[PDB]
Amino acid sequence: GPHMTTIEDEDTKVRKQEIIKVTEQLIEAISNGDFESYTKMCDPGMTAFEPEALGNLVEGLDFHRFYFENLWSRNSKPVHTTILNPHIHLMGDESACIAYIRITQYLDAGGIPRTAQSEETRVWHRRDGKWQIVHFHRSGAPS
Amino acid sequence: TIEDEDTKVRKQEIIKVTEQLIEAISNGDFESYTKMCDPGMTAFEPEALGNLVEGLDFHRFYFENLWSRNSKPVHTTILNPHIHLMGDESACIAYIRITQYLDAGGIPRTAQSEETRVWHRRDGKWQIVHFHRSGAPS
Amino acid sequence: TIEDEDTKVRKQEIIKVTEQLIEAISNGDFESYTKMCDPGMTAFEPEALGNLVEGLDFHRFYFENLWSRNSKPVHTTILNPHIHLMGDESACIAYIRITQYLDAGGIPRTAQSEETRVWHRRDGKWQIVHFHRSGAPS
Amino acid sequence: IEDEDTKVRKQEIIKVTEQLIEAISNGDFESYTKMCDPGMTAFEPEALGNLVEGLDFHRFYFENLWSRNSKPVHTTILNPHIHLMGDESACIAYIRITQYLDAGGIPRTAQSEETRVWHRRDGKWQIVHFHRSGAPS
Amino acid sequence: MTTIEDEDTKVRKQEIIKVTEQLIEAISNGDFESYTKMCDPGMTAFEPEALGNLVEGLDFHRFYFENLWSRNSKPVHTTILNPHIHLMGDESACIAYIRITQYLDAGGIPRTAQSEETRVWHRRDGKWQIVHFHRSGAPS
Amino acid sequence: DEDTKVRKQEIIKVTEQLIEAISNGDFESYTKMCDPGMTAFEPEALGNLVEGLDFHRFYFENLWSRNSKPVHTTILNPHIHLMGDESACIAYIRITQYLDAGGIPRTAQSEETRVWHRRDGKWQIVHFHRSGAPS
Amino acid sequence: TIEDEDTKVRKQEIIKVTEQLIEAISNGDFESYTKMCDPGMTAFEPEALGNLVEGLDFHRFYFENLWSRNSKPVHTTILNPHIHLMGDESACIAYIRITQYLDAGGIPRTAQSEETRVWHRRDGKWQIVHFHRSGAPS
Amino acid sequence: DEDTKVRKQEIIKVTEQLIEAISNGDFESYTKMCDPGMTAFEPEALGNLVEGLDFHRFYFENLWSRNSKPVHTTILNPHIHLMGDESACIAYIRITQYLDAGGIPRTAQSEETRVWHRRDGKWQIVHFHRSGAPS
Amino acid sequence: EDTKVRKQEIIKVTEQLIEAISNGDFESYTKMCDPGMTAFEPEALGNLVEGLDFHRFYFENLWSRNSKPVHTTILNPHIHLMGDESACIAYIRITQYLDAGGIPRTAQSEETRVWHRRDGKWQIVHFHRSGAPS
Amino acid sequence: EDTKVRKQEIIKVTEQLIEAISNGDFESYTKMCDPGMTAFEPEALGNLVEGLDFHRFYFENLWSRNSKPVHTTILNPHIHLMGDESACIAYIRITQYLDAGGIPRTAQSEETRVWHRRDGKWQIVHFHRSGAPS
Amino acid sequence: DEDTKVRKQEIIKVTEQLIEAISNGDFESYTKMCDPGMTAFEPEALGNLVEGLDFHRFYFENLWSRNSKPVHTTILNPHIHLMGDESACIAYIRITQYLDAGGIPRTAQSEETRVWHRRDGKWQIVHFHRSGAPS
Amino acid sequence: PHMTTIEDEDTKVRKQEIIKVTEQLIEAISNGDFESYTKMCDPGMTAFEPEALGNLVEGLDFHRFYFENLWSRNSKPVHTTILNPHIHLMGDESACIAYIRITQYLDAGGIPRTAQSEETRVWHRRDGKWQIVHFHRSGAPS
Amino acid sequence: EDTKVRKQEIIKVTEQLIEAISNGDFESYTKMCDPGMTAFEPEALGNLVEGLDFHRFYFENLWSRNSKPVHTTILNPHIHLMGDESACIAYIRITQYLDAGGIPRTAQSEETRVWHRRDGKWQIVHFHRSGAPS
Amino acid sequence: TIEDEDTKVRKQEIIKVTEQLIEAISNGDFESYTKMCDPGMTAFEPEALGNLVEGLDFHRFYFENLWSRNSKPVHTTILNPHIHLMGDESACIAYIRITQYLDAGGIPRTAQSEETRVWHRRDGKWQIVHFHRSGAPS
Numbered sequence A: 001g002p003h004m005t006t007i008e009d010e011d012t013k014v015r016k017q018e019i020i021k022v023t024e025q026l027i028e029a030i031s032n033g034d035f036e037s038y039t040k041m042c043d044p045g046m047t048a049f050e051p052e053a054l055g056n057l058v059e060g061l062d063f064h065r066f067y068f069e070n071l072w073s074r075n076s077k078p079v080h081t082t083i084l085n086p087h088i089h090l091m092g093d094e095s096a097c098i099a100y101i102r103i104t105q106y107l108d109a110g111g112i113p114r115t116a117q118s119e120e121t122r123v124w125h126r127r128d129g130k131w132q133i134v135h136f137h138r139s140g141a142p143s
Numbered sequence B, C, G, N: 001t002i003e004d005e006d007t008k009v010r011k012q013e014i015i016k017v018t019e020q021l022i023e024a025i026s027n028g029d030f031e032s033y034t035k036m037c038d039p040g041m042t043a044f045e046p047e048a049l050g051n052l053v054e055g056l057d058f059h060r061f062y063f064e065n066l067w068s069r070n071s072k073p074v075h076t077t078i079l080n081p082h083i084h085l086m087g088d089e090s091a092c093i094a095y096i097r098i099t100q101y102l103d104a105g106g107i108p109r110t111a112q113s114e115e116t117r118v119w120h121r122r123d124g125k126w127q128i129v130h131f132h133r134s135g136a137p138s
Numbered sequence D: 001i002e003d004e005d006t007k008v009r010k011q012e013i014i015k016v017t018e019q020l021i022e023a024i025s026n027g028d029f030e031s032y033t034k035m036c037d038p039g040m041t042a043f044e045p046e047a048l049g050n051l052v053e054g055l056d057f058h059r060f061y062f063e064n065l066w067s068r069n070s071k072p073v074h075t076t077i078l079n080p081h082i083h084l085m086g087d088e089s090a091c092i093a094y095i096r097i098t099q100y101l102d103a104g105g106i107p108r109t110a111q112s113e114e115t116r117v118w119h120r121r122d123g124k125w126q127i128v129h130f131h132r133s134g135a136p137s
Numbered sequence E: 001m002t003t004i005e006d007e008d009t010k011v012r013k014q015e016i017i018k019v020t021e022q023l024i025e026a027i028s029n030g031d032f033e034s035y036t037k038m039c040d041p042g043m044t045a046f047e048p049e050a051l052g053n054l055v056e057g058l059d060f061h062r063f064y065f066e067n068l069w070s071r072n073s074k075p076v077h078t079t080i081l082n083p084h085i086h087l088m089g090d091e092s093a094c095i096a097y098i099r100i101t102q103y104l105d106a107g108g109i110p111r112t113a114q115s116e117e118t119r120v121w122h123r124r125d126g127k128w129q130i131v132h133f134h135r136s137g138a139p140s
Numbered sequence F, H, K: 001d002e003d004t005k006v007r008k009q010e011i012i013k014v015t016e017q018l019i020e021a022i023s024n025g026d027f028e029s030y031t032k033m034c035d036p037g038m039t040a041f042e043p044e045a046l047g048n049l050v051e052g053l054d055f056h057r058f059y060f061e062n063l064w065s066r067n068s069k070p071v072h073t074t075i076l077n078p079h080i081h082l083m084g085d086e087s088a089c090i091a092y093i094r095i096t097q098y099l100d101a102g103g104i105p106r107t108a109q110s111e112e113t114r115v116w117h118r119r120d121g122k123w124q125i126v127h128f129h130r131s132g133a134p135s
Numbered sequence I, J, M: 001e002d003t004k005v006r007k008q009e010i011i012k013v014t015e016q017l018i019e020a021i022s023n024g025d026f027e028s029y030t031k032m033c034d035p036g037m038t039a040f041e042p043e044a045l046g047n048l049v050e051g052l053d054f055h056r057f058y059f060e061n062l063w064s065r066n067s068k069p070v071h072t073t074i075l076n077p078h079i080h081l082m083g084d085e086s087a088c089i090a091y092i093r094i095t096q097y098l099d100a101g102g103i104p105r106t107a108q109s110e111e112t113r114v115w116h117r118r119d120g121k122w123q124i125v126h127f128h129r130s131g132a133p134s
Numbered sequence L: 001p002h003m004t005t006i007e008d009e010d011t012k013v014r015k016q017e018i019i020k021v022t023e024q025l026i027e028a029i030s031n032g033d034f035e036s037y038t039k040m041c042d043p044g045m046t047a048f049e050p051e052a053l054g055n056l057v058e059g060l061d062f063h064r065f066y067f068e069n070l071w072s073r074n075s076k077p078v079h080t081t082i083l084n085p086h087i088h089l090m091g092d093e094s095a096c097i098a099y100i101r102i103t104q105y106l107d108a109g110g111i112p113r114t115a116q117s118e119e120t121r122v123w124h125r126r127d128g129k130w131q132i133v134h135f136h137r138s139g140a141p142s
């Protein structure tokens, strides 16, 4: 279009929104204890670092399934999630990386509104059309 | 039909640059470091107090203020590495970083941290586009 | 040139909307609240754990899960207010917010917080475009 | 094409904020006052919960704390957000991270949330109010 | 030489001590109506409950009145120690004293609280009103 | 009535003057500004109501060592109450910026009430109440 | 110095009044207490938090608000008494006051305090002119 | 007529004198003012009733940082009880302003009771009770 | 050797004494105590008490004898016979009780008892208990 | 009146014993102590000690006397005479000292000294100390 | 080669089997997998080297409550060392996800070393060393 | 005779063989002699120890640090005791030894203190000499 | 040949002793102890105790000898034979028990038992326990 | 009396050797210590951390590096000794061992501990076959 003297290419804008959407979708699946949708979004050889893994690098979805079968009783109180200061890094058409602060507003524990924070890194890989998480790193203490 | 073992060498490729990156960090060599980082590099680390930091500017300070690291031998070990290849220009490595240092009463101590490094191939050389360090140690 | 009498009423104007805003917050009236906030409202507050929050989405939680304050009588006082007028569509107010509440053993307690509210006049009514709170109200 | 002047207006605000921070960081009180409205208002850890007026209260840290002749300082402005309000009024909120030494000659990091309210007067931008949360400086 | 006019400063001071006692009784009985009657609308105050802030009006004080009824049953004895009055004109007085409160608690345990108080009085249309007060020593 | 405006500024000026005298360890000027039967409540008096200026003479004799610490005072949120033409009352937050305490800039806060009485032309403090830190 | 050893029953009278006085306090008998107290009596005691009190009003509060002497059987001991006869109209006695009480669950406990009682004879009956207590007991 | 007024001032003067002697570590003047069978309750005696001046002698002989330091004492809210012409009782708050701790000004409070007995012309302390911490 | 029987004697009255303590039997206690008795014990807070008066309170205001297991052990006792009518016994007193912990707890105390014979029976003229163990 | 003197007699030896202790003179100490002297003191850690051998140590490793002014007071002495040959004194021992920075401090201890007369002089047979001081 | 690959998987399988038996409180299967003269180091043994299976019977026999909370085990970063055809050594991180503690999900970690010896066909544990928490 | 005092007799010497190399290994460690140490360890040696913070470490690289930065192990007397040893023989080239390692050392001001640690050493015979293939230390020592 | 069986003999009586203790069976216990038995154990607070009287408190006031699943292990035993009527055994005593809500825990204590053969049966003449069990 | 009672002589012989043993320890006379200890002697002591030690090898270390007695005097007291004669060849002695040492800070201090010593005599000489200590001396 007009104004050729500059990168009129803002598909990077929509590509990033693409990544933000799948991340939101992933979080919703997690938040609703929907393990099926979750696995659908994760690469089988998915790798992860998270408080629940006590400093160990975990492989597969098997380890996460636990929390999706027991704590699945997730439905016991309201839980609003906010993704702050997102930053996406595009790497090829099949590879993306997103880092953001994850803020969770929940009740319970004494029945009072409380807020939890965690730093998250999600590494995305495009396979046969849909984006899948290949690795993620969570920092803080919340799930 | 022993096919696809170049993934084996590609992963070793990633392990080597990660080792190189850690050595540069460990030797306070900021020049080599920047050479290995994308200008728009993003990071999550204890020193950033929960904030997502951009650029190398924030890291320069720690490189310049430790200058004489010699005041103690520093050995690093990369444990249980795991590489994820994504295209020919994109890689992801996750490992436990163990650091053996002295100081603190000249006594030998060990620090652990979980690290994620996201690599992107630009014009021949690999560069870090994002990294996430969990723990608190150095 | 003491025509600075309208600045007197302009400031009272700002003090009134601030009082109105606080009342809406105090009564858990999220509708009135949103009516007074710009959609792209920005905020710094204890509940946000050091993060700059955007939109009203983050606030509608405490506005929809914090009504158990009837058995917890509340009174708010705005102390030492200071308004800064900037054009006819832009104002800034800073004050100490003191809250008297019960509970914590049916006993009377007092909380203090420093607040900054940035106001912008849009199509007739004043709206908050950004606010910064220090302390820990709710 | 135009609709990107808000883009340059915001960069304008980010520049004066950077300039302000540099003046503070270099203990240059003259440049500082030049950038502040005489009736400037402020909330900051050093004021112990009180709303302070004028630059008189700040002169103290530029004087009795310009003794940085023994340690270098680096400042980072994170996740900036500007709100434009008319052509003479702006509002910027950011996380201010400070890397300083001492405390054992060791590298340490400080964080603080800052809000700066800007007003355009006779050409140059001036701070009319600011709110600092956390502590750092 | 100074018999008359001195004998009256004596009664003027007792006058101030009486209103101060009355004020304290109203406070002690949670009687906000009598309290407001004794305070100037633009009354100013410094007190532990205000966390280092100068408070205006009676609005801030109503809270403690309305939320301290059980005290009705709670026996309360107040003592005003080492009073000092400063007369300033016929319509202006200043009194400073140590306020000691003897109260019970849970288990009916007797405890004592101390606070230094300054009350500034102004005569308006016949009755004395508090224009400013300063309370120290964290007690209520 | 606006002379109330100048009357209040009058009180603010003497208060500033008083603080300056205190800040400079100038006991002569101080006594000149205090009524002989001056009464006071302050942290240094440990909960006791002190009389006269005698008790304050000491924080002047042993604090004059100020030639080792620049001091700046700020009077915040002042509020004056006028009561007759010879009686005033001022309440304010007193913020003090001082060094030492290691050598680093520090800030102290205290709430102060000063009761003023006009005697033979000049204003004199008849009572004062300080709560906080400042000495 | 051996003549008129009456300074034996003289001191003994003082212990008699001091003992009476202590019984009144122990039984919650304000009337007896006042009879032995000069209306202009002053006191230093832990309950007065460092202040010097005058009159009997201050002490009345502990009598009026403590009638449960029922489940409150209390024993008192006056250790190492020392009387100072001043003239024939006055006396001063100092002793340790040990009191054994229950409560504290119903377990036996002991408290101690130093007391000074300054007596002065008005008419034929003695009265407490001033007293000072240190320690625990009330 | 009010001789009770002068009698009380008489007691206040000897108390001031006593405190000065104590403050200056002048044990001779002190003993001169105390009855040989003097009794005492004080923090330094750990809950015990002490007799004679022997116990106090230590604090003089071994506390000379008193001489090397400006010490200011204030007697607050004094109350005297007269009992006959040879017997008096005074109770007051004793406030002490001293330096040390690096030349820092600090304040100490103690409640004191002094029992006076007139013997052969001069007043002597027969018993005293100090509550708090001073000496 | 005749000294062993006269010492064993003292042990008997000491045991007898402790026996009465634990039985709330104040009457037997008084019989064994000299009216001018003196004492240093934890429940006296560093003061020397005189008489039996100060001791009734614990006899009366605490008869949880058949409520708790009051068992006392006298260890390493040493006796000093001083003339025909004067004895000194010093031992470690070990008590094992219940409740107030509900657990079988053990308490230790150094105890010195000074005896003196009067018209036949032995009586305590002074005792000194250190540690705390009631 | 005769008792008045005998009791006062026990107060003198007690003070002399203390004098010798304070002084650091062990020769005097032994002479006033019976060989079989038994003791309970804070340095024995709950143990009934026997003989002089255990106290010698404190007599040889605390000679820094002058290097510390020390004043003792004996409060509320109570003596029990038990026949011509034995006595018992109980008192509060208050000690005023410095050191630890030269700050005048005050220690307290409950003491019980049991005396037995051997020919000319009085000898301590047993003693009990509570608190911690000497 | 390529058999060292299957030999190691062989060891990983018996280790998994062992852990399952432990996890299900199945002492019979456990003993079947342990050499009678089995040696062990583990937190429950308080620093002592224990012999036989007798000592382990207690943790099985007395924690049957497992039949309540889902127990999931993960073997992380396994490392096998082959030594001859009848001897193997495996070291791994053992992560256990369990409930309880309020029916709340919690995770325990422990470092384990298992020494295997082939006897008459089947692999048997000859010694094991546990660091950490796990049952 | 009773068919065993021949074989039982060599298992006896084989176990002493293992106890000797273990003692040798400990001496090398105790003297900060990294060369002898590496000589006794298989290159692919694996280890679990307090210094590794719950991680399984590989190679000798990680241990080099405690040898090159522990030259003080040559300044003060160090006595080691191996208690309640237990050897498990597995083939002629494979052995396993478990023991309590007690260390008596000074300092902290020349003060004598004792440290305890449970150790497991897995030995493998390669080309004549015994080498450590894996070890697990729980407790403290080093 | 026989020292082997003599030692097993000692290990058996020690096991029997521990079982009696573990089952709160004081009768069997006393049967196995010499009347003048001496002991050092945590419950005695650093004091050397005599007789069985002191022990009858822990067997007695602890009738939860069921509600406490108890397994005992004797580790690294070492016997010293001294004559045909005297033996000494030292071992680590490990106890596996449950809890305040069935939690499995382990306690360790070092024990020394000194045995003396009297009229046929072995009796404990002295024992020393370190740790805190019973 | 009876041929017996001389048992006190046997008991006293043990008190003699026990004292000789303690004295040898304090001197730092390992040689004598060896002659007094059976080579297969067993021990329980705080310096062993819960483990039963055997032989005299483990104790050597203390007769070498522990030289605070080799330059600072210490007095030992044995209290309430109790002996059990199991024969003419076997003895058992139990006692509290108080130790008065100097420094540890410089101020005279006292340490306690109970010790059990089991003695066995071979060819005329008494030797300890086992000992158990509680507390922490040497």
Ligand SMILES: [Cl-]
Pocket: A030, A136
């Ligand atoms: Cl996740």
Ligand SMILES: [Cl-]
Pocket: B025
């Ligand atoms: Cl980095």
Ligand SMILES: [Cl-]
Pocket: C025, C131
């Ligand atoms: Cl808000």
Ligand SMILES: [Cl-]
Pocket: D024, D130
């Ligand atoms: Cl600023």
Ligand SMILES: [Cl-]
Pocket: E027, E133
């Ligand atoms: Cl009020």
Ligand SMILES: [Cl-]
Pocket: F022
């Ligand atoms: Cl002032």
Ligand SMILES: [Cl-]
Pocket: G025, G059, G131
């Ligand atoms: Cl009273």
Ligand SMILES: [Cl-]
Pocket: H022, H135
């Ligand atoms: Cl004095």
Ligand SMILES: [Cl-]
Pocket: I021, I127
């Ligand atoms: Cl008793």
Ligand SMILES: [Cl-]
Pocket: J021, J134
């Ligand atoms: Cl002594």
Ligand SMILES: [Cl-]
Pocket: K022, K128, K135
């Ligand atoms: Cl297992």
Ligand SMILES: [Cl-]
Pocket: L029, L135, L142
């Ligand atoms: Cl090793």
Ligand SMILES: [Cl-]
Pocket: M021, M134
């Ligand atoms: Cl037992």
Ligand SMILES: [Cl-]
Pocket: N025, N138
């Ligand atoms: Cl030994």
